[PDB]
């Protein structure tokens, strides 16, 4: 999920306002990427034995 897009729909002002909040979007994106990598690793370990 693109945090910037979901919170702000192609809006410059909303993006500027969110930039002040901090690194919430980066943290959420990192968590989602880690979840996806964990799913891939689970599939590999369960099947590729």
């Amino acid at each position: 999920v693109d945090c910037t897009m979901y919170i702000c729909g192609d809006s410059t002002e909303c993006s500027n306002l969110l930039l002040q909040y901090g690194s919430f979007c980066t943290q959420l994106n990192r968590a989602l990427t880690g979840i996806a990598v964990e799913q891939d690793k689970n599939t590999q370990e369960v099947f590729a034995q």
């Binding site: 002040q20 901090g22 943290q27």
Partner: protein, 175 residues
């Protein structure tokens, strides 16, 4: 393990070599060569004291954990599985390996037929794992990844304070 076991001063295990896994008395730190390599391999640690963050000390110092591991190793070498299920019972390492071979379905006699071959293979495997750990940097990926994740989480938490959230400045006193 309730008790603490130590190997005898003389190491005569029928050709088996455990020097690479037992503690080294010479060095001030009583840790094995593999343990020393693992400790050296791992490298945002001392900077974690600025704004209320504190790192509570580990209850079990690395020396105590090393002592526990050494006791487990000595018990396994001198007695086998007996010390883990009651009173520790001594037994030659050759006979312990024979018991293991019987456990995995292989006949006892084979081990006594070429005990030297098994001892040499075990020593070679120990050396091979030592070399692989020395020459490979991704072996300890799990612990380094966990440490990096914790460090970056702490850094993000600290940096979140910089956000002003619409205020003139993030400093409470100034605003």
């Amino acid at each position: 393990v309730k008790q603490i076991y130590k190997t005898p001063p003389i190491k005569d295990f029928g050709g088996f070599n455990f020097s690479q896994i037992l503690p080294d008395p010479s060095k001030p730190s009583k840790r094995s060569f593999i343990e020393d390599l693992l400790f050296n391999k791992v490298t945002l640690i001392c900077a974690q004291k600025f704004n209320g963050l504190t790192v509570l000390p580990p209850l079990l110092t690395d020396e105590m954990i090393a002592q526990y591991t050494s006791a487990l190793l000595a018990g396994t070498i001198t007695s086998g599985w007996t010390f883990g299920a009651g009173a520790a019972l001594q037994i030659p390492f050759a006979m312990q390996m024979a018991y293991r071979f019987n456990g995995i379905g292989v006949t006892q006699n084979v081990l006594y037929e070429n005990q030297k071959l098994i001892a040499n293979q075990f020593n070679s495997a120990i050396g091979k794992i030592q070399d692989s750990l020395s020459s490979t940097a991704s072996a300890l990926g799990k612990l380094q990844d966990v440490v990096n994740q914790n460090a970056q989480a702490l850094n993000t938490l600290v940096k979140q304070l910089s956000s002003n959230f619409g205020a003139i400045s993030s400093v409470l006193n100034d605003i």
